[PDB]
């Protein structure tokens, strides 16, 4: 019983969502295609790109070496086998080269063993060194040229972007006050007529033939001295490039910055010609400037823009087009692209090495595999993958999360001029980009805009670049839009009339303005490409997950959009009552759950593996059980069906960590009743009814991991033993079998999680001791009890252990580090006082109290409510639709129904009312069933609600109930007082998820414990644990106050002042006396720290000449 | 509401920090060493409440604020010798335990 | 007047609307609630205290050959309601062995002594192709709600102690209708129902209840 | 070491009223379970003695003013309401009260026809002031009641001319109670009832409570012998 609400849906959200990646790497890692086809980008590009290593003297003798195929292949171990042994799931990539000569010879070392390449799991990410990571896609200005208004003072400039940050120079031509036209390639500033001269243009042939309608020229001529002779020119320019190299005429170097598609080419033809040609005059060719034609250089783009500049400086073509942020200039470097360039980088070093060898060595002693030293593609490539800031940890608290992590567009990346946390033009940028093909309400905090998500239906098709959404054009198809799409306007979804949508007023979007209704009403070829396949496309994948966004105010809606992520799989996930269609997917493209293959059948046996789907061959399916999450969430997989076929409205076949059977179920939906509660729901705190716990509802499991490394220090090998000195207490083997704790070994804080022994020789015991030792058989010792022990964290049953030691296979371990024990501990975490409950509409609040079913608002029939979500502020303050759900709540409680009310499409107040008309003729239908009806209380109420003009007076009591039910909710007693709550109190089944916080993890408490021997303030220890911070703000607080003593205490008797400190842990342990300081441990060390620099800090008393007696001990 | 009549104390002293200071040293010489410097022992002594009944509270400042709202005590440049200010404490059994 | 009509439409171990009659305009709840209160709270019951399974170290497991999952298994048993047929038993320990294919629904427990698996069916474990389950699962007599505090020692090894939910009362409400002749349409018509129960009977809940409230009421005896 | 299964009931016996009481350790969920019904019942069900119908020779209804009398019907009317009578032997359904008014002097609730078996608990009580026109004659009625009752009982008595006042019979006249948590028993979430019965409509506080404690007790009984259906 699932009631849908809606309209149209011409296509699909576009699988697999994890397509930004996945289908990205592959098309970059072309590999999987017979070495005959596939031509550019990534893998091969970088290959072909990296020009065949030339050598000494431009083709004078032997040694050329060209590249042929590439071979990814025979992978090392195996996923899981990696994460286990900390192996970076890679694969051998060798490449077939063949150096040429000039004395007969064409050697070809097959394969030529080479660097390793990390593969992308089916999931769409990589395992690096054991842990899971995802390559977040950044955005920069799409290669080209756009000019832009000179920020200084009115007077535009010219910027010339390059293919990708790490490739080609980012030039800028600026018309200035003092100087006139500066060409600033990389780090330089040289007159612009200078390069022009070389290129050819110059006095008269240049100006008075280029620049006329807008002077600005007398200055472009001042150094005509430069514009008097090319060649000598390159040299003056060359001589303008540090350091003092040979002014000798070269052409080389400038054999780049234009010449050879080697360090300056947006190749193919796309993204560069199209740009300028449709910005500048028109016409061009692959790369700026063109040399090696025959001596001189035939430039393409340089003066025409200088031209198009002045035209923008008093002319008409104007267009101050800047980093216009128009996603017609916002490139999106997919992983493969990011991973590509890094592969480019590697070769930008492989070669250096080869060129180096080509020389030294002898022509015949030289052959591939020898000039090649497969070290650069490693490092330069492994360094990127797991050492970038764009190569993050896997967010995996709830299945949606990790999914979302790929659908993410980053911007705080490494790219060139890539807005740093506060890069030049932070704010302003953030702003919603009218180009709505990227989430409109996803950002977080203090990091606004920069980190956006991605439109659901966004991007797909021959991808040169930028997101492009979907748009109808009269049933046709969808024509993958194009950010700089003008297609005579688009008409916002709705007005549907089967196929002709008779409107008269088509609410449509054209360019920017929400222009009324162009009304092209062309029916066929829909007003250009008007219409939008569903509204979802104006939104991000996890926002969609809001059954009533339409009402939810954008802003607050983001506190749900985001927050939702911070979920955390529970034991009884349950999809959400009201829910928007998408859920049937987000947890299926997440590959978090198991998907049957061809047809049906089964066999199984049940448990730790759905045993095959008996159609054709056979494949027992292992079910990732009580694993472990990056966030320590603990995602697992439940199964389904004994003997069946392929599907039933879903070929699920075993759930996952949050699917209510293929239905993303982040949290559990329960019954709430709005209304303050004697103060337990203040500000935003929620009130739980113990019941929840009793029925193990919001309970969540978490399995932590611990780690002790057995070093080797020059005092005696650090070893994991069960014979820990004097620890003898029946603890060791009371658990810890043969060294490490056992499984199921329930653990408390303090136990010997894992124990090992160091040698550390602090002192040599003189006799007397060895004597007593000998005498009182005090067998000497050479070992410390350095164990592992479970920290202040309550501990919990020991879910599993793992052991890794060198000598073992793949295992690569920190020099010296011999063996590295690992132990996972589980923790069923029910629900406590603290924790954020936060739902979908962003009603994030922390739990305050959990009342006994005793108290708590009694519904009439006696059922208790579940959560007492406060109204105050909350909705009014935040204005949202967390209500339309609570209303369609009971109207889905008694009617036993789940509901599909998608974003901006259906589930209308009146329909809900109908759905509320029903459920009553039963909810109340029961009273006149069990044999009851309206009691002296509901009489009191109604006769007060109607007074509050809430109910239609004149109707009967009973009639007033249905009235007061298709909105609020029946009287609603108070099991605590026995009486009622004058004035109805709306009730319903919201749906509150439970975020990753849950108190426990927060809250420590120090009194003394561990003192640090490096700094000297409270912290780092082993026994108990604590430490707290006193960041200046609190200092002012005290200053502003007057707790001088209370202050000097937090910089003395409580941290560094060893004397005073002790005076504290003693003056108390003693009794009737409190901490008596005097000389501050700090003042005493300021003088004897300045004296080191040979400064006398004579301390003087009142009379100036009573000269202190400090440190006089 | 607050303490044993703060407003009352803030009246006596002039500089709000005075009272703070006097009440401080006070308790810090009261049950800080001795215990027999009370002025509330006639029948107006601070007592608590737990399982077996009352029991004056170890909180020294407590008495002070109450022993100060009383009548005894003084403060200024009086008693001069801080030395003989505690030396006289010898004339009447002090010391603690270790 | 001076006397009510303690009507009592009973049932078969559950339900149990219990009507008083012409109650003075007001007492409908003076009595009507405290009972429902008590009924829900304090009152003896029977709850699963601890459970040991064949080849299972501790919770967070996965018995080969069974569909379910020990947690689930324990999440289900958490609902088993046993009757005791006697009064001397701090508790007993149920048993259960199950072969190859089938469902270990509640019933399947060891038919034994003063113990009524009041709630058969109660899907306990859809095991199959690998009949393997032997379980020893305690069942103490408790009161109220007592979680992972009351250790499930017993089998001192893999007890994997389970949460306890003792109250046999499964829900309670009470109409205060007005439909009597007594003296001037005023009076309340109390009528609590002490709905569903674990093992015990509403008339017993309703009774035991009136007891505690009378027992406490007393306390306002001798003042100091 | 003190609390267990035997809470300490602590009174305050302010005397004629304000019976601040304090039974203590109670399992979370009884400071309510008890405090309320008592408080509830306290405000109601409890024998009384409240003027309920008045007659003052001369002007009919209540909306008036009798010359040579500083007050006006209502003021007197209301005064009367604060009158505290008490009856001697059991067989006194209600003996009326009549009055004698003199010159300027005050008409305390004492002047009342000093009838035995019915002594006005409260001597003073303004009642009304009269001067150079010492008329004011009244023969007010009194009654035995349960709680509180408006102008619906009708002041029969003196047939016509009654301006029947409201039936405020219940010695208790305000009942509050807050159950804070205390942790004598180690556990820190135990209940601490505490009541405070303001009564003076005649009967003492502790009396009210106990009496009501009985009132509830007895009713509980009812849940004894049943007549069910299968
Ligand atoms: C190697 O990557 C690093 C580069 C740093 O350098 C630097 C300058 O470049 C960054 C880039 C390129 C980002 O894209 C980024 C980011 O996307 C993000 C946060 C931080 N956001 N959180 C602040 C705290 N709050 C409670 C939640 C939101 C960031 O600070 C950064 C960030 C940087 O600081 N997040 C979000 O947008 C949101 C909304 C959610 C993300 C989910 C979880 C939280 C993450 O997955 C966690 C688990 C980790 O991935 C990070 C710690 C990465 O560290 C590692 C080792 O993995 C870090 C990105």
JSON list of C-alpha atoms and ligand atoms in Angstrom, two decimals, chain A residues 132-134 136 138 387-396 404-405 408-414 420-421 442-445 447 450-452 562 565-566 630-631 997, ligand 1:
[
{"chain": "A", "resi": 132, "resn": "UNK", "atom": "CA", "xyz": [38.62, 4.14, 1.11]},
{"chain": "A", "resi": 133, "resn": "UNK", "atom": "CA", "xyz": [38.91, 7.45, -0.66]},
{"chain": "A", "resi": 134, "resn": "UNK", "atom": "CA", "xyz": [36.94, 9.35, -3.26]},
{"chain": "A", "resi": 136, "resn": "UNK", "atom": "CA", "xyz": [36.24, 14.99, -5.49]},
{"chain": "A", "resi": 138, "resn": "UNK", "atom": "CA", "xyz": [36.82, 20.57, -8.79]},
{"chain": "A", "resi": 387, "resn": "UNK", "atom": "CA", "xyz": [48.14, 12.99, -0.47]},
{"chain": "A", "resi": 388, "resn": "UNK", "atom": "CA", "xyz": [45.95, 15.44, -2.35]},
{"chain": "A", "resi": 389, "resn": "UNK", "atom": "CA", "xyz": [43.36, 17.62, -0.69]},
{"chain": "A", "resi": 390, "resn": "UNK", "atom": "CA", "xyz": [41.07, 16.60, -3.49]},
{"chain": "A", "resi": 391, "resn": "UNK", "atom": "CA", "xyz": [41.62, 12.95, -2.55]},
{"chain": "A", "resi": 392, "resn": "UNK", "atom": "CA", "xyz": [39.48, 12.69, 0.57]},
{"chain": "A", "resi": 393, "resn": "UNK", "atom": "CA", "xyz": [38.46, 10.01, 3.05]},
{"chain": "A", "resi": 394, "resn": "UNK", "atom": "CA", "xyz": [35.23, 8.20, 2.25]},
{"chain": "A", "resi": 395, "resn": "UNK", "atom": "CA", "xyz": [32.22, 9.71, 3.99]},
{"chain": "A", "resi": 396, "resn": "UNK", "atom": "CA", "xyz": [30.31, 6.57, 4.89]},
{"chain": "A", "resi": 404, "resn": "UNK", "atom": "CA", "xyz": [26.72, 12.14, -2.23]},
{"chain": "A", "resi": 405, "resn": "UNK", "atom": "CA", "xyz": [30.49, 12.38, -1.79]},
{"chain": "A", "resi": 408, "resn": "UNK", "atom": "CA", "xyz": [30.25, 16.65, -5.10]},
{"chain": "A", "resi": 409, "resn": "UNK", "atom": "CA", "xyz": [31.82, 19.55, -6.91]},
{"chain": "A", "resi": 410, "resn": "UNK", "atom": "CA", "xyz": [34.79, 20.95, -5.00]},
{"chain": "A", "resi": 411, "resn": "UNK", "atom": "CA", "xyz": [36.53, 24.29, -5.37]},
{"chain": "A", "resi": 412, "resn": "UNK", "atom": "CA", "xyz": [38.95, 24.56, -2.46]},
{"chain": "A", "resi": 413, "resn": "UNK", "atom": "CA", "xyz": [41.14, 22.27, -4.58]},
{"chain": "A", "resi": 414, "resn": "UNK", "atom": "CA", "xyz": [44.69, 22.50, -5.94]},
{"chain": "A", "resi": 420, "resn": "UNK", "atom": "CA", "xyz": [41.89, 29.07, -1.36]},
{"chain": "A", "resi": 421, "resn": "UNK", "atom": "CA", "xyz": [39.85, 28.94, 1.85]},
{"chain": "A", "resi": 442, "resn": "UNK", "atom": "CA", "xyz": [23.67, 22.25, -0.27]},
{"chain": "A", "resi": 443, "resn": "UNK", "atom": "CA", "xyz": [26.68, 24.25, 1.09]},
{"chain": "A", "resi": 444, "resn": "UNK", "atom": "CA", "xyz": [27.69, 23.96, 4.72]},
{"chain": "A", "resi": 445, "resn": "UNK", "atom": "CA", "xyz": [29.20, 26.62, 7.01]},
{"chain": "A", "resi": 447, "resn": "UNK", "atom": "CA", "xyz": [32.88, 27.18, 3.70]},
{"chain": "A", "resi": 450, "resn": "UNK", "atom": "CA", "xyz": [32.79, 26.65, -2.62]},
{"chain": "A", "resi": 451, "resn": "UNK", "atom": "CA", "xyz": [31.61, 23.14, -1.86]},
{"chain": "A", "resi": 452, "resn": "UNK", "atom": "CA", "xyz": [28.48, 22.46, -3.83]},
{"chain": "A", "resi": 562, "resn": "UNK", "atom": "CA", "xyz": [22.91, 18.27, 4.80]},
{"chain": "A", "resi": 565, "resn": "UNK", "atom": "CA", "xyz": [23.78, 12.76, 5.68]},
{"chain": "A", "resi": 566, "resn": "UNK", "atom": "CA", "xyz": [24.99, 12.64, 9.26]},
{"chain": "A", "resi": 630, "resn": "UNK", "atom": "CA", "xyz": [34.90, 5.12, 8.09]},
{"chain": "A", "resi": 631, "resn": "UNK", "atom": "CA", "xyz": [32.82, 7.04, 10.54]},
{"chain": "A", "resi": 997, "resn": "UNK", "atom": "CA", "xyz": [26.97, 12.87, 17.42]},
{"chain": "E", "resi": 1, "resn": "LIG", "atom": "C1", "xyz": [42.11, 14.94, 1.81]},
{"chain": "E", "resi": 1, "resn": "LIG", "atom": "O1", "xyz": [40.87, 15.71, 1.86]},
{"chain": "E", "resi": 1, "resn": "LIG", "atom": "C2", "xyz": [40.93, 16.75, 2.92]},
{"chain": "E", "resi": 1, "resn": "LIG", "atom": "C3", "xyz": [41.45, 18.08, 2.34]},
{"chain": "E", "resi": 1, "resn": "LIG", "atom": "C4", "xyz": [41.64, 19.19, 3.08]},
{"chain": "E", "resi": 1, "resn": "LIG", "atom": "O2", "xyz": [41.97, 20.51, 2.51]},
{"chain": "E", "resi": 1, "resn": "LIG", "atom": "C5", "xyz": [40.88, 21.45, 2.09]},
{"chain": "E", "resi": 1, "resn": "LIG", "atom": "C6", "xyz": [41.45, 22.84, 2.02]},
{"chain": "E", "resi": 1, "resn": "LIG", "atom": "O3", "xyz": [40.38, 21.05, 0.77]},
{"chain": "E", "resi": 1, "resn": "LIG", "atom": "C7", "xyz": [39.07, 20.67, 0.91]},
{"chain": "E", "resi": 1, "resn": "LIG", "atom": "C8", "xyz": [38.37, 20.17, -0.16]},
{"chain": "E", "resi": 1, "resn": "LIG", "atom": "C9", "xyz": [38.93, 20.04, -1.55]},
{"chain": "E", "resi": 1, "resn": "LIG", "atom": "C10", "xyz": [37.00, 19.72, 0.11]},
{"chain": "E", "resi": 1, "resn": "LIG", "atom": "O4", "xyz": [36.27, 19.22, -0.82]},
{"chain": "E", "resi": 1, "resn": "LIG", "atom": "C11", "xyz": [36.44, 19.85, 1.51]},
{"chain": "E", "resi": 1, "resn": "LIG", "atom": "C12", "xyz": [35.10, 19.38, 1.78]},
{"chain": "E", "resi": 1, "resn": "LIG", "atom": "O5", "xyz": [34.37, 18.79, 0.82]},
{"chain": "E", "resi": 1, "resn": "LIG", "atom": "C13", "xyz": [34.58, 19.51, 3.11]},
{"chain": "E", "resi": 1, "resn": "LIG", "atom": "C14", "xyz": [35.37, 20.01, 4.18]},
{"chain": "E", "resi": 1, "resn": "LIG", "atom": "C15", "xyz": [34.95, 19.95, 5.58]},
{"chain": "E", "resi": 1, "resn": "LIG", "atom": "N1", "xyz": [33.69, 19.88, 5.89]},
{"chain": "E", "resi": 1, "resn": "LIG", "atom": "N2", "xyz": [33.28, 19.54, 7.18]},
{"chain": "E", "resi": 1, "resn": "LIG", "atom": "C16", "xyz": [33.70, 20.33, 8.34]},
{"chain": "E", "resi": 1, "resn": "LIG", "atom": "C17", "xyz": [33.32, 19.60, 9.62]},
{"chain": "E", "resi": 1, "resn": "LIG", "atom": "N3", "xyz": [31.82, 19.31, 9.64]},
{"chain": "E", "resi": 1, "resn": "LIG", "atom": "C18", "xyz": [31.45, 18.56, 10.86]},
{"chain": "E", "resi": 1, "resn": "LIG", "atom": "C19", "xyz": [31.40, 18.58, 8.38]},
{"chain": "E", "resi": 1, "resn": "LIG", "atom": "C20", "xyz": [31.82, 19.35, 7.14]},
{"chain": "E", "resi": 1, "resn": "LIG", "atom": "C21", "xyz": [36.65, 20.52, 3.91]},
{"chain": "E", "resi": 1, "resn": "LIG", "atom": "O6", "xyz": [37.28, 21.09, 4.99]},
{"chain": "E", "resi": 1, "resn": "LIG", "atom": "C22", "xyz": [37.23, 20.41, 2.61]},
{"chain": "E", "resi": 1, "resn": "LIG", "atom": "C23", "xyz": [38.61, 20.84, 2.26]},
{"chain": "E", "resi": 1, "resn": "LIG", "atom": "C24", "xyz": [39.70, 21.32, 3.00]},
{"chain": "E", "resi": 1, "resn": "LIG", "atom": "O7", "xyz": [39.85, 21.61, 4.22]},
{"chain": "E", "resi": 1, "resn": "LIG", "atom": "N4", "xyz": [33.29, 18.98, 3.43]},
{"chain": "E", "resi": 1, "resn": "LIG", "atom": "C25", "xyz": [32.13, 19.17, 2.80]},
{"chain": "E", "resi": 1, "resn": "LIG", "atom": "O8", "xyz": [31.94, 19.84, 1.81]},
{"chain": "E", "resi": 1, "resn": "LIG", "atom": "C26", "xyz": [30.99, 18.44, 3.47]},
{"chain": "E", "resi": 1, "resn": "LIG", "atom": "C27", "xyz": [29.76, 19.31, 3.62]},
{"chain": "E", "resi": 1, "resn": "LIG", "atom": "C28", "xyz": [31.04, 17.14, 3.92]},
{"chain": "E", "resi": 1, "resn": "LIG", "atom": "C29", "xyz": [32.16, 16.15, 3.86]},
{"chain": "E", "resi": 1, "resn": "LIG", "atom": "C30", "xyz": [32.13, 14.98, 4.53]},
{"chain": "E", "resi": 1, "resn": "LIG", "atom": "C31", "xyz": [33.17, 14.42, 5.49]},
{"chain": "E", "resi": 1, "resn": "LIG", "atom": "C32", "xyz": [33.11, 15.33, 6.74]},
{"chain": "E", "resi": 1, "resn": "LIG", "atom": "C33", "xyz": [34.57, 14.33, 4.87]},
{"chain": "E", "resi": 1, "resn": "LIG", "atom": "O9", "xyz": [34.50, 13.25, 3.94]},
{"chain": "E", "resi": 1, "resn": "LIG", "atom": "C34", "xyz": [35.77, 14.14, 5.83]},
{"chain": "E", "resi": 1, "resn": "LIG", "atom": "C35", "xyz": [35.67, 12.82, 6.64]},
{"chain": "E", "resi": 1, "resn": "LIG", "atom": "C36", "xyz": [37.15, 14.20, 5.17]},
{"chain": "E", "resi": 1, "resn": "LIG", "atom": "O10", "xyz": [37.06, 13.91, 3.75]},
{"chain": "E", "resi": 1, "resn": "LIG", "atom": "C37", "xyz": [37.98, 15.50, 5.27]},
{"chain": "E", "resi": 1, "resn": "LIG", "atom": "C38", "xyz": [38.50, 15.77, 6.70]},
{"chain": "E", "resi": 1, "resn": "LIG", "atom": "C39", "xyz": [39.15, 15.45, 4.26]},
{"chain": "E", "resi": 1, "resn": "LIG", "atom": "O11", "xyz": [40.29, 14.88, 4.94]},
{"chain": "E", "resi": 1, "resn": "LIG", "atom": "C40", "xyz": [40.57, 13.56, 4.77]},
{"chain": "E", "resi": 1, "resn": "LIG", "atom": "C41", "xyz": [41.77, 13.15, 5.50]},
{"chain": "E", "resi": 1, "resn": "LIG", "atom": "O12", "xyz": [39.91, 12.86, 4.10]},
{"chain": "E", "resi": 1, "resn": "LIG", "atom": "C42", "xyz": [39.53, 16.80, 3.59]},
{"chain": "E", "resi": 1, "resn": "LIG", "atom": "C43", "xyz": [38.44, 17.14, 2.62]}
]
